């Protein structure tokens, strides 16, 4: 779709689309940029992630509204429409996963990029798991778990405990444990250990890095308050 547009123009248009709150456009521009085949910089990875999180976030919110109506209802219209939204959501998750598999992850050699993409892989399998029903749910859940675990192993070896990507990975893997894997105790243990190890490393940070790390630590604390 975007094969005739310059990489730099796609990036520029993705930034404009974010300003205009046109997240479907932003995702399409960033997909086009990935398909140019070059690795993404830190800023460009963030644009890719923001675009898709907004697109799939709207789909997930709609799916939850429709699933709630459908549960309450138990004609075919509510199920049919929930199914349509679900298929669209699955299609976007499959598109992101396909970008990660062709070929963002395999070309990511630095820890910052590899952890970032594996966290994405875990998140998009987690979104597939939210709508999956049965034994399909089992294999999708294991794919999410495996991606998060590999990201966790790299992050603990290669990044300080205050690194924002390390922190956000741990936050999202804790939500996976609580909401998907029915392991609330693992969720709480991970959030607590992550928070405590970050706290102990705050003294090493500049003012600006402190603000970045403590923002995500507050998210860990918010979950712990809800879960305990």
């Amino acid at each position: 779709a975007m094969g005739s547009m310059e990489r730099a123009s796609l990036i520029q248009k993705a930034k404009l689309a974010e300003q205009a709150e046109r997240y479907e456009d932003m995702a399409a521009f960033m997909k086009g940029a990935v398909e140019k085949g070059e690795e993404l910089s830190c800023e460009e990875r963030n644009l890719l992630s923001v675009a898709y999180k907004n697109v799939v976030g709207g789909q997930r919110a709609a799916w939850r509204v429709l699933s709630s109506i459908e549960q309450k209802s138990n004609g075919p219209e509510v199920r049919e429409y929930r199914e349509k939204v679900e298929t669209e959501l699955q299609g976007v998750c499959d598109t992101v996963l396909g970008l990660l598999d062709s070929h963002l992850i395999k070309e990511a050699g630095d820890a910052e990029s590899r952890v970032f993409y594996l966290k994405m892989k875990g998140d998009y399998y987690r979104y597939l798991a939210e709508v999956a029903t049965g034994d399909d749910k089992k294999r999708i859940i294991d794919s999410a778990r495996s991606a998060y675990q590999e990201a966790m192993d790299i992050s603990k070896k290669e990044m300080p405990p205050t690194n924002p990507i390390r922190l956000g990975l741990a936050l999202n893997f804790s939500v996976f444990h609580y909401e998907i894997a029915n392991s609330p105790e693992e969720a709480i243990s991970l959030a607590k250990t992550t928070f405590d190890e970050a706290m102990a490393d705050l003294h090493t940070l500049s003012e600006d890095s402190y603000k970045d790390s403590t923002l995500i630590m507050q998210l860990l604390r918010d979950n712990l308050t809800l879960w305990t």
Partner: peptide
């Protein structure tokens, strides 16, 4: 239970 919002950047 909240994941990273991740909707702005």
């Amino acid at each position: 239970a909240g994941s990273i919002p991740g909707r702005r950047s």
